[PDB]
């Protein structure tokens, strides 16, 4: 083999130089290495020739006398070790080396030096803190090089590897901080909890420094630290940032209780209370012309019975939800409930409240007449309708608390159930001390039935979701202890762990104390309760241990039938890491293999986890798999598959999916048990005319709203065993979607808070270039007026650089101000 003539000549020249450097006398050692190093650091701004001289160069470096000659020798060994590395010999030589300016030895060398520093920083033991400072100083020298030469994302990699994101704040300038913070946010989804909080805290630090509060609030909501949310809300002072914070709290649904000393406090609490949510939503619905009450009959396509009529009423309420415009239950509503049979009048009135949800003024007046109804079920449904109306939306005088005064602890089981569920939906996320101090004593009542006690626990859990309310947990545990185990573990105690999971939602770690106190409970219910509270607390964390513990326990034979907790393990499989697309599309495939070879109880609970992964997101593979498994032999499996399709298509108005359900309705026309819930799935698909989505992931589909997932999980827990409970009595548990029902369109205001007709470009927004933490790139600009339905996969962007939003996140509400360069 024959190299280039000049390449061979230079190779022989370097061979002569190294032999001269390898000679006996050291008087020529210095001149030889002076000549050598100049061309060694030539190609980096050569290394092939000195490939077989590894041992000789090591001997020369060791033989070199201490001083200048030795540290250049260590310099040459280091810059050559990047090729001849059987170990991190580059860094060990460089630590012995000069420690002068390294950045001039080529980009390849400094990048390899940066990584070896990261390896040593991780490798060094706790007792070794001598060399840590020199590596930190070396890191603080290479970060400016990475910032200049667009290497900031790997600079973030090494600083997070060495846990020095605190000085990442001090070094990064705003000119490139947006992509660094986006890179941090992406890493947040996968890093475990202690460094996850560390990256969240530093992300707040960067945005607080750079006056980037609107996205900082998004990150604060990820941190679920209400104290930090209050601190950063105080930190920002401008009127524009104050009012966008209140939209974000209002859109999230959690009410922030503050003082009137702040400027424009009345508007801030109003927009946080979502008082104008209903007015804007109806106004945009009218502007789209989507206001006509869609009859359940022509949804069914009847061109070719008491429970079936009930399902028709429920889907009508789902379609006309948040609207308040439906004469079917308003004019002849009394006739319909009178014609209705048995237990369905409560749900029909609650469905009417679903039509009137978020319509406080309109709903209360139109439900006042039905409040004085004769039947106990109608009265209870009317009271539940009031709670649905006041659910989500906050009010200054809070009419729900005064309206539900005698019914909060009323002796009648049905009347108490409606009020308790109504207060739970109303005070969901309010965390109000007065509401808690009035409903927890109702939890302590012994006259209430087992299911009534469970509903009280559900209400307490959704009110105090993600609050770690100690007295709520103590009452929950005390009520469980007082109740006898034999009657506890029958079919309805499954709500008590749900309240515990909601109260400790997104916290973790401390759950060991709760499960230790719960350890006294017998195995059939303890093994279910401890798993449910664990998965709910560790939801949205990517803790793939908690899923594999679920996978291990749901694998057991478990065949009195304690194997029911295999189902909550399946729900926990999706619940832990439903956050991003990864951890959801593959746990989806896990559910496929669960159905592919699994227990009857396992395959009963799998569609519930499938719906939890992609609620309101009609993924084609999900819809096909659910449709194929909707005809399984097990009736409960078919029921779960029917409901799963309704949830994944909920609030989408997906035409082809609706056709599939209509085909399923024809298939299941003979059996009403599947038929009425196929109708239910269609109503879920057309719920709110598709204007309100049901996915609990908001703020660019990366924030977990505690109230919405609380109500969603309550429905899925109920749908663990609907083969018994929806057939029997739980026609009221389906109304937990109010928390998860949030609008998915854009409402644009201005600095004077008036609706703007500003047009935006909307289309698929998926990553194209991954060279750095670049913002998600949108394609398919189908621009039109600002009311646009924001679904999964596709986002919105301003048509021109003329209106500057308060936050680049474009969903729900946003204020657009005139750009200084607008012309």
């Amino acid at each position: 083999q024959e190299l280039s003539e000049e390449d061979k000549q230079l190779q022989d020249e370097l061979e002569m130089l190294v032999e001269r450097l390898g000679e006996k006398d050291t008087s020529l050692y210095r001149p030889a290495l002076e000549e050598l190093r100049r061309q060694i650091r030539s190609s980096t701004t050569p290394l092939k020739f000195l490939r077989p001289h590894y041992g000789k160069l090591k001997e020369i470096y060791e033989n070199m006398a201490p001083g200048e000659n030795k540290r250049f020798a260590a310099d040459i060994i280091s810059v050559l070790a990047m090729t001849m590395s059987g170990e991190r010999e580059c860094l060990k030589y460089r630590l012995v080396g000069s420690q002068e300016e390294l950045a001039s030895w080529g980009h390849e060398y400094v990048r390899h030096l940066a990584g070896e520093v990261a390896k040593e920083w991780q490798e060094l033991d706790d007792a070794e803190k001598v060399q840590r400072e020199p590596l930190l100083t070396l890191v603080k020298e290479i970060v400016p090089y990475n910032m200049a030469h667009n290497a900031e994302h790997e600079a973030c990699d090494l600083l997070m590897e060495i846990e020095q994101v605190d000085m990442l704040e001090k070094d990064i300038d705003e000119n490139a901080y947006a992509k660094v913070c986006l890179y941090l946010t992406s890493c947040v989804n996968y890093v475990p909890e202690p460094e996850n909080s560390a990256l969240l805290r530093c992300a707040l630090g960067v945005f607080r420094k750079f006056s980037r509060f609107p996205e900082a609030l998004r990150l604060a909501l990820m941190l679920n630290d209400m104290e930090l949310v209050e601190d950063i809300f105080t930190s920002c002072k401008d009127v524009v940032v104050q009012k966008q914070m209140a939209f974000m709290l209002g859109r999230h649904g959690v009410f922030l209780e503050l003082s009137e000393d702040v400027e424009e406090y009345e508007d801030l609490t109003e927009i946080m209370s979502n008082v104008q949510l209903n007015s804007n939503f109806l106004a945009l619905a009218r502007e789209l012309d989507i206001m006509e009450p869609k009859v359940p009959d022509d949804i069914y396509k009847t061109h070719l019975s008491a429970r079936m009529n009930l399902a028709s009423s429920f889907v009508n309420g789902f379609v006309n939800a948040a609207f308040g415009q439906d004469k079917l239950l308003t004019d002849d509503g009394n006739k319909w409930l009178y014609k209705n049979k048995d237990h369905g009048m409560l749900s029909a009135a609650a469905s009417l409240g679903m039509i009137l949800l978020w319509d406080v003024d309109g709903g209360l007046t139109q439900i006042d007449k039905y409040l004085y109804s004769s039947e106990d079920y109608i009265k209870s449904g009317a009271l539940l309708a009031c709670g649905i109306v006041n659910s989500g939306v906050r009010n200054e005088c809070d009419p729900a608390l005064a309206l539900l005064s005698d019914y909060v602890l009323h002796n009648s089981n049905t009347m108490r159930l409606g009020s308790i569920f109504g207060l739970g939906l109303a005070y969901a996320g309010s965390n109000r001390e007065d509401v808690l101090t009035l409903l927890l004593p109702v939890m302590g009542d012994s006259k209430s039935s087992m299911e009534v006690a469970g509903v009280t626990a559900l209400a307490c859990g959704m009110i105090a979701v993600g609050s770690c309310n100690g007295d709520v947990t103590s009452t929950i545990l005390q009520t469980i202890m007082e109740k006898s185990e034999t009657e506890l573990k029958d079919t309805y105690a499954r709500w008590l762990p749900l309240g515990l999971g909601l109260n400790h939602l997104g916290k973790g770690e401390a759950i060991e104390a709760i499960l230790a106190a719960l350890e006294v409970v017998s195995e059939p219910f303890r093994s279910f309760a401890n798993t449910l509270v664990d998965v709910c607390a560790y939801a949205g964390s990517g803790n793939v241990l908690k899923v594999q513990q679920l996978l291990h326990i749901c694998s057991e034979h478990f065949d009195a039938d304690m194997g029911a907790h295999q189902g909550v393990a399946v729900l926990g499989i999706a619940l832990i890491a439903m956050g991003e697309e990864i951890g959801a599309e593959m746990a989806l495939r896990t559910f496929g293999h669960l159905l592919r070879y699994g227990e009857p109880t396992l395959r009963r609970a799998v569609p519930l986890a499938l719906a939890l992964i992609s609620v309101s997101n009609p993924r084609l593979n999900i819809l096909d798999t659910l449709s194929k498994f909707s005809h399984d032999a097990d009736p409960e499996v078919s029921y779960n598959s029917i409901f799963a399709m309704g949830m994944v298509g909920s609030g989408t108005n997906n035409a082809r999916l609706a056709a599939m359900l209509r085909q399923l309705a024809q298939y299941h026309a003979k059996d009403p048990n599947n038929l009425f819930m196929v109708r239910l799935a269609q109503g879920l698909t057309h719920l709110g005319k598709g204007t309100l989505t049901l996915c609990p992931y908001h703020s660019d589909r990366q924030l977990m709203s505690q109230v919405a997932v609380a109500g969603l999980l309550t429905v899925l827990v109920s749908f663990l065993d609907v083969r018994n409970i929806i057939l029997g009595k739980s026609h009221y548990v389906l109304y937990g979607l109010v928390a998860a029902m949030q609008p998915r369109m854009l409402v644009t205001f201005d600095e004077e808070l008036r609706p703007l007709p500003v047009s935006v470009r909307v289309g698929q927004a998926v990553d194209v270039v991954g060279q750095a933490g670049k913002p998600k790139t949108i394609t398919g600009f189908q621009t039109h007026t600002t009311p646009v339905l924001l679904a999964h996969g596709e986002r919105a962007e301003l048509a021109t650089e003329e209106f500057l939003p308060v936050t680049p996140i474009l969903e729900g509400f946003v204020i657009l101000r005139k750009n200084p360069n607008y012309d």
Binding site: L3, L47, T83, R111, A114, G115, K119
Partner: protein, 403 residues
């Protein structure tokens, strides 16, 4: 200047990321697990029928095991050739067999007919089960078509063509006067030809106006096929299916390949076409005249073969149209405007004048374009959307003439 060996490995290790080798090992393990879990399947059994048939229909499979000695008369099945005066049956078998048997005592000689497939029991080859297959390939399922074609306003009524064919198709099906007042049988045939256009729409209208003996749309291009005898058999089963379906009309369409051109290149170019011609004449010769079945042949040009002079005794009454005038075009506009969300307040007569002899297909096309322009404007209204109706119809007439 290749300088690759050794050098390429060094520069492959020259740069990279700090853990590029790590992710490579990670993704190789990802692919290793992917193959392992594709090998570690779920239902790892190609044979299906796991339990729904293997729990209760299995219990009756015990019954068929108790009756396993019977129900074994399957063996092999083959056609029959002919027979003697009565008892003996000389048969050609798919085993090339010169086969004769005493027909099984359970089977009378009346049921078995020449050219029908019968299974033979290997022990004695008795005529046990004479299967009437009546198997239809997928293309034949296309030759047969829907019966209820649904009636319209004479599908853009061209009063000449329809009224000439009603006395030859509708009247014989009504059978009010064919027997006595007019000579024995109605006119022997109908040739509803014409340029691409109104052809066969009047046939569909006559099908809807008549009884359930409804037409099937067969294509001559489909009928001509590779090899020899397949087209002959296809025409035979075409007549069999039409005869069985209440003696329905047989609608031959695009007769320019089944009859071919007026010539054959060397009598070897299109000879299977000639094979189909001989058998089709043998089928639609009628033999004994019968006012039950009807036949209609529709092409665009009179390119029929030499039987074009025998057909005056068999296939007479050649009629055509496909020449819509102003009154024809505006009536086609009215029946098409019956569909969609349009109303006749539009001055559609102006557009009928604009397009001279625009068939009925283009008028349907123009109406389709008008609906497409309405949805493009996002207005589902079309009753009063007449100016927009006129605008889209005239601009597309411009595009059709010159684009």
């Amino acid at each position: 200047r290749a300088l690759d060996e050794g050098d390429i490995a060094l520069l492959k290790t020259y740069g990279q990321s700090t853990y590029s080798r790590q992710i490579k090992q990670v993704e190789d393990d990802i692919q290793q697990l992917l193959k392992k879990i594709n090998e570690l399947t779920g239902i790892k059994e190609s044979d299906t029928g796991l339990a729904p048939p293997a729990l209760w229909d299995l219990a009756a499979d015990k019954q068929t095991l108790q009756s396993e000695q019977p129900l074994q008369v399957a063996r092999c099945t083959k056609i029959i050739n002919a027979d003697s005066e009565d008892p003996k049956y000389i048969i050609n078998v798919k085993q090339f067999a010169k086969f004769v048997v005493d027909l099984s005592d359970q089977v009378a000689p009346t049921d078995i007919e020449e050219g029908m497939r019968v299974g033979v029991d290997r022990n004695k080859y008795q005529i046990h089960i004479p299967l009437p297959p009546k198997i239809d390939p997928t293309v034949t399922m296309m030759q047969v078509e829907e019966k209820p074609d649904v009636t319209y306003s004479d599908v853009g009524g061209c009063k000449e063509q329809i009224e000439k064919l009603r006395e030859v198709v509708e009247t014989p099906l009504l059978h009010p006067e064919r027997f006595v007042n007019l000579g024995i049988e109605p006119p022997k045939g109908v040739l509803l030809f014409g340029p691409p256009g109104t052809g066969k729409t009047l046939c569909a209208r006559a099908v809807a106006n008549r009884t359930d003996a409804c037409f099937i749309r067969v294509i001559g291009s489909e009928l001509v096929q590779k090899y020899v005898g397949e087209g002959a058999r296809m025409v035979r089963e075409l007549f069999e299916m039409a005869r069985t379906k209440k003696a329905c009309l047989i609608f031959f369409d695009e007769i320019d390949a089944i009859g071919g051109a007026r010539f054959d290149d060397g009598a070897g170019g299109d000879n299977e076409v000639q094979r189909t011609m001989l058998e089709l004449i043998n089928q639609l010769d009628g033999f004994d005249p019968r006012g039950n079945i009807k036949v209609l042949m529709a092409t665009n040009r009179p390119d029929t073969l030499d039987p074009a002079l025998m057909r005056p005794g068999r296939l007479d009454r050649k009629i055509e149209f496909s020449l819509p005038d102003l009154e024809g075009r505006t009536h086609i506009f009215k029946i098409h405007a019956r569909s969609m969300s349009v109303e006749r307040d539009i001055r559609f007569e102006l557009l009928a004048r604009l397009c001279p002899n625009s068939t009925g297909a283009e008028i349907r096309s123009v109406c389709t374009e008008a609906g497409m322009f309405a949805i493009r404007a996002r207005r589902k209204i079309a009753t009063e959307k007449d100016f927009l109706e006129a605008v889209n119809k005239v601009i597309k007439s411009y595009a059709k003439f010159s684009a």
